[PDB]
Design a protein around this ligand. Structure first.
Ligand SMILES: CCN1C(=O)c2cccc3c(S(=O)(=O)NCC4(C(=O)O)CCCC4)ccc1c23
Length: 132
């Protein structure tokens, strides 16, 4: 951990906003109960379920390169804690998650194929959102 750089990890992203008024909506409810749940169980979801551990995954420069980390565990907590004001904010966090993967990794990488498959499913599921 000295001679060869091993990296280090930030605290995970914030998942609650104590100042924010509770505002439940049908789209946010659908995002939690259907979209995220469907994405979570996909065969390729596991790498995206928790924050990247730059040290344990041997990605020592991950957090040099990725300034706005995001993962599905964080998105799940944000939906649970009514952190998002609207569906768009939630969608933006999914976009950040996928694009982080594309930014860090090379286009031909296995993890990129996985992210692309999840992203395609996500975009399909987004078409299902209720009419608020
Ligand atoms: C989605 C967060 N994420 C990365 O961007 C990333 C890059 C490289 C490896 C890796 C991993 S890993 O568990 O070390 N390897 C995952 C796999 C790979 O070939 O990268 C191994 C089998 C499936 C994908 C988990 C989450 C990651 C990455």
């Amino acid at each position: 951990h000295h001679l060869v750089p091993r990296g280090s990890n930030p605290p995970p992203p914030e998942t609650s906003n104590p100042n924010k008024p509770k505002r439940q909506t049908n789209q946010l409810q659908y995002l939690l109960r259907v979209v995220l749940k469907t994405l979570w169980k996909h065969q390729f979801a596991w790498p995206f379920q928790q924050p990247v551990d730059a040290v344990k995954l041997n990605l020592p420069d991950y957090y040099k390169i990725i300034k706005t980390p995001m993962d599905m565990g964080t998105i799940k907590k944000r939906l649970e804690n009514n952190y998002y004001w609207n569906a768009q904010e939630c969608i933006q966090d999914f976009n950040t998650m996928f694009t982080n993967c594309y930014i860090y990794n090379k286009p031909g990488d296995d993890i990129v194929l996985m992210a692309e498959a999840l992203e395609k499913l996500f975009l399909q599921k987004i078409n299902e959102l209720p009419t608020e």
